[PDB]
Design an enzyme around this catalytic site. Structure first.
Site, PDB file in Angstrom:
ATOM      1  N   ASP A   1       1.047   7.168  12.996  1.00 27.56           N
ATOM      2  CA  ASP A   1       2.075   7.964  12.382  1.00 27.56           C
ATOM      3  C   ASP A   1       2.680   7.089  11.296  1.00 27.56           C
ATOM      4  O   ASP A   1       3.055   5.951  11.544  1.00 27.56           O
ATOM      5  CB  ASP A   1       3.133   8.394  13.406  1.00 27.56           C
ATOM      6  CG  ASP A   1       3.926   9.614  12.959  1.00 27.56           C
ATOM      7  OD1 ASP A   1       3.703  10.104  11.842  1.00 27.56           O
ATOM      8  OD2 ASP A   1       4.775  10.106  13.712  1.00 27.56           O
TER       9      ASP A   1
ATOM     10  N   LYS B   1       4.644  -3.467   8.274  1.00 28.41           N
ATOM     11  CA  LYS B   1       5.761  -2.569   7.959  1.00 28.41           C
ATOM     12  C   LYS B   1       7.090  -3.258   8.112  1.00 28.41           C
ATOM     13  O   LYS B   1       7.418  -3.810   9.167  1.00 28.41           O
ATOM     14  CB  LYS B   1       5.772  -1.288   8.802  1.00 28.41           C
ATOM     15  CG  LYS B   1       6.737  -0.200   8.194  1.00 28.41           C
ATOM     16  CD  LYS B   1       7.205   0.854   9.210  1.00 28.41           C
ATOM     17  CE  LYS B   1       6.216   1.978   9.366  1.00 28.41           C
ATOM     18  NZ  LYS B   1       6.492   2.830  10.552  1.00 28.41           N
TER      19      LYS B   1
ATOM     20  N   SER C   1       7.584   1.034   2.798  1.00 31.27           N
ATOM     21  CA  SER C   1       7.323  -0.380   2.565  1.00 31.27           C
ATOM     22  C   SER C   1       6.398  -0.951   3.646  1.00 31.27           C
ATOM     23  O   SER C   1       6.825  -1.394   4.730  1.00 31.27           O
ATOM     24  CB  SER C   1       8.619  -1.186   2.410  1.00 31.27           C
ATOM     25  OG  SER C   1       9.394  -1.097   3.589  1.00 31.27           O
ATOM     26  N   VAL C   2       5.115  -0.889   3.305  1.00 35.86           N
ATOM     27  CA  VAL C   2       4.007  -1.365   4.087  1.00 35.86           C
ATOM     28  C   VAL C   2       3.130  -2.168   3.114  1.00 35.86           C
ATOM     29  O   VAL C   2       2.680  -1.639   2.090  1.00 35.86           O
ATOM     30  CB  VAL C   2       3.141  -0.189   4.611  1.00 35.86           C
ATOM     31  CG1 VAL C   2       1.907  -0.698   5.389  1.00 35.86           C
ATOM     32  CG2 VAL C   2       3.977   0.822   5.449  1.00 35.86           C
TER      33      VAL C   2
ATOM     34  N   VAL D   1       0.807  -1.214   0.000  1.00 32.60           N
ATOM     35  CA  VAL D   1       0.000   0.000   0.000  1.00 32.60           C
ATOM     36  C   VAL D   1       0.855   1.285   0.000  1.00 32.60           C
ATOM     37  O   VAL D   1       0.363   2.365  -0.358  1.00 32.60           O
ATOM     38  CB  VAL D   1      -1.143  -0.062   1.085  1.00 32.60           C
ATOM     39  CG1 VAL D   1      -0.608   0.133   2.528  1.00 32.60           C
ATOM     40  CG2 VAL D   1      -2.327   0.897   0.728  1.00 32.60           C
ATOM     41  N   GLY D   2       2.141   1.145   0.352  1.00 35.46           N
ATOM     42  CA  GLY D   2       3.107   2.275   0.400  1.00 35.46           C
ATOM     43  C   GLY D   2       4.120   2.231   1.545  1.00 35.46           C
ATOM     44  O   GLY D   2       5.348   2.311   1.347  1.00 35.46           O
TER      45      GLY D   2
HETATM   46  C1  LIG Z   1       2.236  -1.298  10.249  1.00 32.78           C
HETATM   47  C2  LIG Z   1       2.612  -0.134  11.142  1.00 32.78           C
HETATM   48  C3  LIG Z   1       3.781  -0.090  11.870  1.00 32.78           C
HETATM   49  C4  LIG Z   1       4.075   1.018  12.671  1.00 32.78           C
HETATM   50  C5  LIG Z   1       3.244   2.142  12.823  1.00 32.78           C
HETATM   51  N1  LIG Z   1       3.661   3.177  13.660  1.00 32.78           N
HETATM   52  C6  LIG Z   1       2.855   4.129  14.159  1.00 32.78           C
HETATM   53  O1  LIG Z   1       1.719   4.280  13.739  1.00 32.78           O
HETATM   54  C7  LIG Z   1       3.209   5.204  15.162  1.00 32.78           C
HETATM   55  C8  LIG Z   1       2.188   5.670  16.036  1.00 32.78           C
HETATM   56  C9  LIG Z   1       2.378   6.705  16.968  1.00 32.78           C
HETATM   57  C10 LIG Z   1       3.638   7.306  16.997  1.00 32.78           C
HETATM   58  C11 LIG Z   1       3.903   8.405  17.986  1.00 32.78           C
HETATM   59  N2  LIG Z   1       4.992   9.065  18.000  1.00 32.78           N
HETATM   60  C12 LIG Z   1       5.553   9.745  19.177  1.00 32.78           C
HETATM   61  C13 LIG Z   1       6.859  10.535  18.895  1.00 32.78           C
HETATM   62  N3  LIG Z   1       6.848  11.148  17.569  1.00 32.78           N
HETATM   63  C14 LIG Z   1       7.833  12.161  17.212  1.00 32.78           C
HETATM   64  C15 LIG Z   1       5.852  10.781  16.542  1.00 32.78           C
HETATM   65  C16 LIG Z   1       5.595   9.286  16.688  1.00 32.78           C
HETATM   66  C17 LIG Z   1       4.666   6.845  16.109  1.00 32.78           C
HETATM   67  C18 LIG Z   1       4.475   5.802  15.189  1.00 32.78           C
HETATM   68  C19 LIG Z   1       2.033   2.115  12.105  1.00 32.78           C
HETATM   69  C20 LIG Z   1       1.714   1.021  11.275  1.00 32.78           C
HETATM   70  N4  LIG Z   1       0.571   0.940  10.582  1.00 32.78           N
HETATM   71  C21 LIG Z   1       0.405   1.562   9.419  1.00 32.78           C
HETATM   72  N5  LIG Z   1       1.290   2.502   9.003  1.00 32.78           N
HETATM   73  C22 LIG Z   1       1.092   3.112   7.837  1.00 32.78           C
HETATM   74  C23 LIG Z   1      -0.023   2.773   7.079  1.00 32.78           C
HETATM   75  C24 LIG Z   1      -0.928   1.793   7.517  1.00 32.78           C
HETATM   76  C25 LIG Z   1      -2.143   1.419   6.697  1.00 32.78           C
HETATM   77  C26 LIG Z   1      -2.218   1.756   5.338  1.00 32.78           C
HETATM   78  C27 LIG Z   1      -3.355   1.421   4.596  1.00 32.78           C
HETATM   79  C28 LIG Z   1      -4.405   0.760   5.221  1.00 32.78           C
HETATM   80  N6  LIG Z   1      -4.319   0.444   6.524  1.00 32.78           N
HETATM   81  C29 LIG Z   1      -3.234   0.750   7.272  1.00 32.78           C
HETATM   82  N7  LIG Z   1      -0.690   1.212   8.715  1.00 32.78           N
END
Ligand SMILES: Cc1ccc(NC(=O)c2ccc(CN3CCN(C)CC3)cc2)cc1Nc1nccc(-c2cccnc2)n1
Ligand SMILES: CCCCCCCCO[C@@H]1O[C@H](CO)[C@@H](O)[C@H](O)[C@H]1O
EC number: 2.7.11.24
Length: 329
Positions: A159, A44, A28-29, A26-27
């Protein structure tokens, strides 16, 4: 240890437990079908997790962060794995979350929101934020494409343009920010939800600061008191266009309480910006505000953040975190 399998995807080697089937990028995910549960997941594969010290720390930071988030309005970790049988092979990390149907942008394009949607949607963000903030974690990059929404209007914070949503103190580079940078953003997001358009569509950061200053006005004595630099104080005054509007005339057809909440979020002075906890109790969330269903985070050890270590130690720390992971039920 599960059995793994290899696959070349958009010019990249993915190797995952066979548990995850039908990988599609979907976008490397990738999106993948978790056969343990029949649910669609997002996978991811971290790029070059241990290539430099900086990469290694971020790998580690993101693992810890994902392992800590356990709240219905914040993304959580279903799985983390490595195809590596040992520390010495350890060079890839993959993280698994729920797949998301839509982000706030998609909802925007697809349906015009009721006041009642805006209340429920902002309520969830804030409830998510009261939980992030209680762990001393600052999001920093809240924007519609980081907000996932299902068919029932349920929201998760994740994020993955950022600046449209950035607190102005970030764009004026102070080394010290507080959690209410995230509230500026919530207010930028709400405004957008009520108005249908982007509140500060700035070509570049100084453009942003200009639009901000004409809507909220130039800072009060009380805030000018807190800026040490004469250069900063002059530069800020140097905007300087057609005056503090009305605010309330930028949002004329909106619910009077919405507009009131927005006034308390879009406060220049971050000392005076309303918090997530306070915002929860604001009359605009009377329909949803339940004090016994707005939890805070367990203690979260980020002593690692001040720490300056060697790639291998960060890689070792990250390995322990992977190995000790406990899947949710
Ligand atoms: C698979 C995965 C692995 C890791 C993460 N990471 C995070 O989501 C995350 C959440 C909160 C923070 C908080 N944070 C505190 C400090 N700072 C500076 C910002 C970060 C950081 C990362 C998300 C995902 N999920 C993800 N990521 C991108 C896209 C998608 C996705 C795309 C399409 C359909 N469904 C889901 N799903
Ligand atoms: C151009 C409009 C921006 C004016 C400057 C933003 C005021 C931000 O607010 C400031 O946040 C700081 C960052 O942590 C705090 O230390 C200060 O106490 C607070 O006043």
């Amino acid at each position: 240890r599960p059995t793994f399998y290899r696959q070349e995807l958009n010019k990249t080697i993915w190797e995952v437990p066979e548990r995850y089937q039908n990988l599609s990028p979907v976008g490397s995910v990738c999106a993948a079908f978790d056969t343990k549960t029949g649910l669609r997941v997002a996978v991811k594969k971290l790029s070059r997790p241990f290539q430099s010290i900086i990469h290694a720390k971020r790998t580690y930071r993101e693992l810890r962060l994902l392992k800590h988030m356990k709240h219905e309005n914040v993304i959580g970790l279903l799985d983390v794995f490595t195809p590596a049988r040992s520390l010495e092979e350890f060079n890839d990390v993959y993280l698994v979350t729920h797949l998301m149907g839509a982000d706030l942008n998609n909802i925007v394009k697809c349906q015009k929101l009721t006041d009642d949607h805006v209340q429920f949607l902002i309520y969830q963000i804030l409830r998510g934020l009261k939980y992030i903030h209680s762990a001393d974690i600052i999001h920093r990059d809240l924007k519609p494409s980081n907000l996932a929404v299902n068919e029932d209007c349920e929201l998760k914070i994740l994020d993955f343009a950022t600046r449209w949503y950035r607190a102005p103190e970030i764009m004026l580079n102070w080394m010290h920010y507080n959690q209410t940078v995230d509230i500026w953003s919530v207010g930028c997001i709400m405004a957008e939800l009520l108005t249908g358009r982007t509140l500060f569509p700035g070509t570049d950061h100084i453009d942003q600061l200009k639009l901000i200053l004409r809507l909220v006005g130039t800072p009060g004595a009380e805030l000018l008191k807190k800026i040490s630099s004469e250069s900063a104080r002059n530069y800020i005054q140097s905007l300087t266009q057609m005056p503090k509007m009305n605010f309330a005339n930028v949002f004329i057809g909106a619910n009077p309480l919405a507009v009131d909440l927005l006034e308390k979020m879009l406060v220049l002075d971050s000392d005076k910006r309303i918090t997530a906890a306070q915002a929860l109790a604001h009359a605009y969330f009377a329909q949803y505000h339940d004090p016994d269903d707005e939890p805070v985070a367990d203690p979260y050890d980020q002593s690692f953040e001040s720490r300056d270590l060697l790639i291998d130690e960060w890689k070792s720390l990250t390995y322990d975190e992977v190995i000790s992971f406990v899947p949710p039920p």
